[PDB]
Design a protein around this ligand. Structure first.
Ligand SMILES: C=C1[C@H](O)CC(=C/C=C2\CCC[C@]3(C)[C@@H]([C@H](C)CC#C[C@@H](O)[C@]45C[C@H]6C[C@H](C[C@H](C6)C4)C5)CC[C@@H]23)C[C@H]1O
Lengths: 11, 240
Protein backbone atom coordinates (compact mmCIF):
# COMPACT_ATOMS: atom_id res chain seq x y z
CA UNK A 1 0.00 0.00 0.00
CA UNK A 2 3.14 2.16 0.17
CA UNK A 3 3.50 3.91 3.52
CA UNK A 4 5.57 7.10 2.95
CA UNK A 5 5.56 8.17 6.60
CA UNK A 6 6.11 4.74 8.15
CA UNK A 7 8.80 4.28 5.50
CA UNK A 8 10.62 7.50 6.41
CA UNK A 9 10.40 6.86 10.16
CA UNK A 10 11.93 3.38 9.73
CA UNK A 11 14.66 4.61 7.38
CA UNK B 1 22.65 -18.53 32.43
CA UNK B 2 22.23 -15.13 30.80
CA UNK B 3 25.01 -15.33 28.23
CA UNK B 4 27.04 -12.35 27.04
CA UNK B 5 24.77 -11.79 24.05
CA UNK B 6 21.62 -11.96 26.19
CA UNK B 7 22.83 -9.43 28.75
CA UNK B 8 23.52 -7.23 25.72
CA UNK B 9 20.02 -7.70 24.23
CA UNK B 10 18.49 -6.69 27.57
CA UNK B 11 20.83 -3.72 28.03
CA UNK B 12 19.96 -2.54 24.51
CA UNK B 13 16.18 -2.91 24.96
CA UNK B 14 16.26 -1.16 28.33
CA UNK B 15 18.06 1.80 26.77
CA UNK B 16 15.91 1.79 23.62
CA UNK B 17 12.85 1.96 25.85
CA UNK B 18 14.38 4.75 27.92
CA UNK B 19 15.10 6.73 24.77
CA UNK B 20 11.49 6.38 23.61
CA UNK B 21 9.43 6.66 26.79
CA UNK B 22 9.43 9.94 28.72
CA UNK B 23 7.86 9.24 32.15
CA UNK B 24 7.21 12.96 32.64
CA UNK B 25 5.03 12.97 29.52
CA UNK B 26 6.09 16.55 28.76
CA UNK B 27 5.28 16.41 25.02
CA UNK B 28 1.61 15.80 25.80
CA UNK B 29 1.28 19.58 25.77
CA UNK B 30 1.74 19.60 22.00
CA UNK B 31 -1.35 17.39 21.51
CA UNK B 32 -4.70 18.99 20.68
CA UNK B 33 -6.39 19.76 24.06
CA UNK B 34 -8.54 17.00 25.56
CA UNK B 35 -12.26 17.78 25.88
CA UNK B 36 -14.36 16.00 28.50
CA UNK B 37 -17.67 17.82 27.99
CA UNK B 38 -21.72 15.65 20.10
CA UNK B 39 -19.47 12.94 21.62
CA UNK B 40 -16.07 11.92 20.26
CA UNK B 41 -14.81 14.93 22.19
CA UNK B 42 -11.60 13.03 23.08
CA UNK B 43 -10.92 11.87 19.52
CA UNK B 44 -8.57 14.76 18.65
CA UNK B 45 -6.52 14.45 21.85
CA UNK B 46 -6.29 10.65 21.93
CA UNK B 47 -5.71 10.54 18.15
CA UNK B 48 -2.67 12.73 18.76
CA UNK B 49 -1.51 10.68 21.77
CA UNK B 50 -1.76 7.50 19.74
CA UNK B 51 -0.06 9.15 16.76
CA UNK B 52 2.75 10.24 19.07
CA UNK B 53 2.92 6.75 20.55
CA UNK B 54 3.14 5.09 17.14
CA UNK B 55 6.24 7.22 16.44
CA UNK B 56 7.85 6.13 19.72
CA UNK B 57 6.97 2.47 19.19
CA UNK B 58 8.66 2.69 15.76
CA UNK B 59 11.82 4.16 17.29
CA UNK B 60 11.81 1.32 19.82
CA UNK B 61 11.41 -1.32 17.13
CA UNK B 62 14.36 -0.01 15.11
CA UNK B 63 16.59 -0.68 18.13
CA UNK B 64 15.46 -4.31 18.53
CA UNK B 65 18.60 -6.30 17.68
CA UNK B 66 17.86 -8.13 14.44
CA UNK B 67 14.92 -5.96 13.35
CA UNK B 68 17.09 -3.89 11.02
CA UNK B 69 18.02 -7.08 9.14
CA UNK B 70 14.40 -7.61 8.09
CA UNK B 71 13.27 -6.28 4.73
CA UNK B 72 11.67 -2.88 4.31
CA UNK B 73 8.25 -4.44 3.73
CA UNK B 74 8.40 -6.87 6.67
CA UNK B 75 9.39 -4.08 9.03
CA UNK B 76 6.34 -2.22 7.74
CA UNK B 77 4.05 -5.20 8.15
CA UNK B 78 5.23 -5.90 11.73
CA UNK B 79 4.78 -2.27 12.82
CA UNK B 80 1.37 -1.76 11.26
CA UNK B 81 -0.02 -4.85 12.98
CA UNK B 82 1.61 -4.45 16.40
CA UNK B 83 1.43 -0.69 16.86
CA UNK B 84 -1.86 -0.64 18.78
CA UNK B 85 -0.75 -3.69 20.83
CA UNK B 86 2.60 -2.18 21.88
CA UNK B 87 0.80 1.07 22.77
CA UNK B 88 -1.58 -0.92 25.00
CA UNK B 89 1.35 -2.87 26.35
CA UNK B 90 3.61 0.17 26.92
CA UNK B 91 0.72 2.15 28.41
CA UNK B 92 0.70 -0.24 31.37
CA UNK B 93 3.50 1.97 32.74
CA UNK B 94 1.11 4.88 33.31
CA UNK B 95 -1.91 2.73 34.16
CA UNK B 96 -2.84 2.55 37.85
CA UNK B 97 -5.07 0.06 39.65
CA UNK B 98 -5.80 2.78 42.20
CA UNK B 99 -8.64 3.96 39.98
CA UNK B 100 -8.31 1.94 36.73
CA UNK B 101 -6.96 4.87 34.72
CA UNK B 102 -3.84 5.87 32.82
CA UNK B 103 -2.29 8.65 34.88
CA UNK B 104 0.18 10.79 32.93
CA UNK B 105 1.12 13.58 35.32
CA UNK B 106 -1.78 16.02 35.49
CA UNK B 107 -5.58 15.90 35.51
CA UNK B 108 -5.59 16.98 31.86
CA UNK B 109 -3.55 13.91 31.01
CA UNK B 110 -5.29 11.38 33.23
CA UNK B 111 -7.41 9.00 31.17
CA UNK B 112 -10.16 6.62 32.24
CA UNK B 113 -12.95 4.51 30.76
CA UNK B 114 -15.10 7.54 29.91
CA UNK B 115 -12.33 9.27 27.96
CA UNK B 116 -11.83 6.06 25.96
CA UNK B 117 -15.53 5.95 25.13
CA UNK B 118 -15.33 9.61 24.08
CA UNK B 119 -12.91 8.43 21.40
CA UNK B 120 -15.49 6.18 19.78
CA UNK B 121 -15.11 2.90 21.70
CA UNK B 122 -17.62 0.88 23.73
CA UNK B 123 -17.28 -1.77 26.43
CA UNK B 124 -16.70 -4.09 23.50
CA UNK B 125 -13.07 -2.90 23.65
CA UNK B 126 -12.89 -1.12 27.01
CA UNK B 127 -13.95 -4.02 29.25
CA UNK B 128 -11.25 -6.37 27.94
CA UNK B 129 -8.81 -3.46 27.67
CA UNK B 130 -8.99 -2.73 31.43
CA UNK B 131 -9.02 -6.46 32.15
CA UNK B 132 -5.77 -6.61 30.14
CA UNK B 133 -4.15 -3.75 32.01
CA UNK B 134 -5.10 -5.29 35.36
CA UNK B 135 -3.74 -8.75 34.57
CA UNK B 136 -0.56 -7.21 33.17
CA UNK B 137 -0.08 -4.85 36.12
CA UNK B 138 -0.47 -7.73 38.58
CA UNK B 139 2.39 -9.68 37.00
CA UNK B 140 4.64 -6.97 38.43
CA UNK B 141 7.10 -7.41 35.54
CA UNK B 142 10.72 -6.31 35.93
CA UNK B 143 11.39 -3.52 33.43
CA UNK B 144 13.61 -6.10 31.65
CA UNK B 145 10.64 -8.38 31.05
CA UNK B 146 8.50 -5.39 30.05
CA UNK B 147 10.80 -4.32 27.19
CA UNK B 148 11.36 -7.93 26.14
CA UNK B 149 7.62 -8.56 25.88
CA UNK B 150 7.11 -5.42 23.72
CA UNK B 151 9.91 -6.47 21.34
CA UNK B 152 8.55 -10.04 21.13
CA UNK B 153 5.15 -8.54 20.28
CA UNK B 154 6.60 -6.47 17.44
CA UNK B 155 8.63 -9.36 15.96
CA UNK B 156 5.85 -11.95 15.59
CA UNK B 157 6.04 -14.32 12.57
CA UNK B 158 2.30 -14.98 12.21
CA UNK B 159 1.37 -11.38 11.35
CA UNK B 160 -0.37 -11.69 7.98
CA UNK B 161 1.56 -10.23 5.07
CA UNK B 162 4.89 -11.35 6.50
CA UNK B 163 7.35 -12.71 3.93
CA UNK B 164 10.55 -13.73 5.69
CA UNK B 165 8.58 -15.56 8.40
CA UNK B 166 11.54 -17.75 9.36
CA UNK B 167 13.83 -14.73 9.83
CA UNK B 168 11.22 -13.01 11.99
CA UNK B 169 10.87 -16.22 14.03
CA UNK B 170 14.65 -16.46 14.46
CA UNK B 171 14.74 -12.90 15.79
CA UNK B 172 11.76 -13.42 18.11
CA UNK B 173 13.03 -16.82 19.35
CA UNK B 174 16.30 -15.15 20.31
CA UNK B 175 14.24 -12.67 22.33
CA UNK B 176 12.06 -15.40 23.91
CA UNK B 177 15.07 -17.40 25.11
CA UNK B 178 16.49 -14.18 26.51
CA UNK B 179 13.22 -13.65 28.39
CA UNK B 180 12.80 -17.29 29.48
CA UNK B 181 16.38 -17.30 30.77
CA UNK B 182 16.09 -13.91 32.47
CA UNK B 183 13.03 -15.11 34.39
CA UNK B 184 14.77 -18.25 35.63
CA UNK B 185 17.98 -16.47 36.67
CA UNK B 186 16.69 -13.02 37.62
CA UNK B 187 13.03 -13.38 38.61
CA UNK B 188 12.65 -15.09 42.01
CA UNK B 189 9.60 -17.08 43.15
CA UNK B 190 6.69 -16.69 43.68
CA UNK B 191 6.44 -13.85 41.15
CA UNK B 192 8.18 -16.06 38.58
CA UNK B 193 5.65 -18.89 38.79
CA UNK B 194 4.18 -19.36 35.32
CA UNK B 195 5.44 -15.85 34.59
CA UNK B 196 6.52 -16.71 31.04
CA UNK B 197 3.34 -18.57 30.13
CA UNK B 198 1.35 -15.70 31.61
CA UNK B 199 3.29 -13.17 29.55
CA UNK B 200 2.69 -15.11 26.37
CA UNK B 201 -1.01 -15.28 27.22
CA UNK B 202 -1.06 -11.46 27.33
CA UNK B 203 0.20 -11.44 23.73
CA UNK B 204 -2.87 -13.55 22.85
CA UNK B 205 -5.17 -11.18 24.74
CA UNK B 206 -3.68 -8.36 22.65
CA UNK B 207 -4.56 -10.21 19.45
CA UNK B 208 -8.14 -10.07 20.64
CA UNK B 209 -7.88 -6.37 21.56
CA UNK B 210 -6.34 -5.55 18.18
CA UNK B 211 -9.25 -7.30 16.46
CA UNK B 212 -11.86 -5.22 18.29
CA UNK B 213 -9.78 -2.11 17.65
CA UNK B 214 -9.84 -2.83 13.92
CA UNK B 215 -13.61 -3.36 13.71
CA UNK B 216 -14.51 -0.14 15.47
CA UNK B 217 -11.89 1.75 13.44
CA UNK B 218 -13.71 0.59 10.31
CA UNK B 219 -16.93 2.09 11.68
CA UNK B 220 -15.26 5.31 12.77
CA UNK B 221 -13.36 5.95 9.54
CA UNK B 222 -16.65 4.97 7.93
CA UNK B 223 -17.49 8.66 8.21
CA UNK B 224 -14.92 11.18 6.84
CA UNK B 225 -16.09 13.63 9.52
CA UNK B 226 -14.27 11.53 12.13
CA UNK B 227 -11.56 10.22 9.81
CA UNK B 228 -10.75 13.85 9.05
CA UNK B 229 -10.09 14.37 12.81
CA UNK B 230 -7.19 11.87 12.92
CA UNK B 231 -3.56 12.47 11.96
CA UNK B 232 -1.71 11.47 8.76
CA UNK B 233 0.39 8.77 10.47
CA UNK B 234 -2.63 7.23 12.23
CA UNK B 235 -4.50 7.06 8.90
CA UNK B 236 -1.50 5.45 7.23
CA UNK B 237 -0.78 2.89 9.98
CA UNK B 238 -4.34 1.82 10.90
CA UNK B 239 -5.71 2.26 7.37
CA UNK B 240 -6.48 4.94 4.77
C1 LIG C 1 3.18 7.31 26.38
C2 LIG C 1 2.17 6.50 26.85
C3 LIG C 1 1.49 6.64 28.24
O1 LIG C 1 1.66 5.40 28.96
C4 LIG C 1 -0.03 6.97 28.11
C5 LIG C 1 -0.78 6.03 27.15
C6 LIG C 1 -1.98 5.61 27.52
C7 LIG C 1 -2.89 4.72 26.83
C8 LIG C 1 -4.22 4.79 26.80
C9 LIG C 1 -5.12 5.85 27.51
C10 LIG C 1 -5.83 6.71 26.42
C11 LIG C 1 -6.69 5.77 25.48
C12 LIG C 1 -5.77 4.64 24.82
C13 LIG C 1 -4.73 5.33 23.79
C14 LIG C 1 -6.54 3.47 24.14
C15 LIG C 1 -7.20 3.74 22.72
C16 LIG C 1 -8.33 4.84 22.71
C17 LIG C 1 -7.85 2.41 22.23
C18 LIG C 1 -7.88 2.50 20.80
C19 LIG C 1 -7.90 2.65 19.63
C20 LIG C 1 -7.92 2.95 18.22
O2 LIG C 1 -9.04 2.25 17.64
C21 LIG C 1 -8.03 4.48 17.98
C22 LIG C 1 -6.77 5.27 18.58
C23 LIG C 1 -6.84 6.81 18.22
C24 LIG C 1 -8.19 7.44 18.81
C25 LIG C 1 -9.45 6.68 18.19
C26 LIG C 1 -9.42 6.82 16.59
C27 LIG C 1 -8.09 6.20 16.02
C28 LIG C 1 -6.83 6.96 16.63
C29 LIG C 1 -8.04 4.66 16.40
C30 LIG C 1 -9.41 5.15 18.58
C31 LIG C 1 -5.47 2.30 24.15
C32 LIG C 1 -4.48 2.59 25.27
C33 LIG C 1 -5.15 3.79 26.00
C34 LIG C 1 0.00 5.67 25.85
C35 LIG C 1 1.54 5.38 26.00
O3 LIG C 1 2.18 5.37 24.69
Amino acid sequence: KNHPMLMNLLK
Amino acid sequence: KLSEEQQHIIAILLDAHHKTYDPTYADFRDFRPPVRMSPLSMLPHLADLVSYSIQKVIGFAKMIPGFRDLTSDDQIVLLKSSAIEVIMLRSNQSFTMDDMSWDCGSQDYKYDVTDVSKAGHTLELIEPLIKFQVGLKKLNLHEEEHVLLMAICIVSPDRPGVQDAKLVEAIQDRLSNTLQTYIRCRHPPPGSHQLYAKMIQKLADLRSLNEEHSKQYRSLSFQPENSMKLTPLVLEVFGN
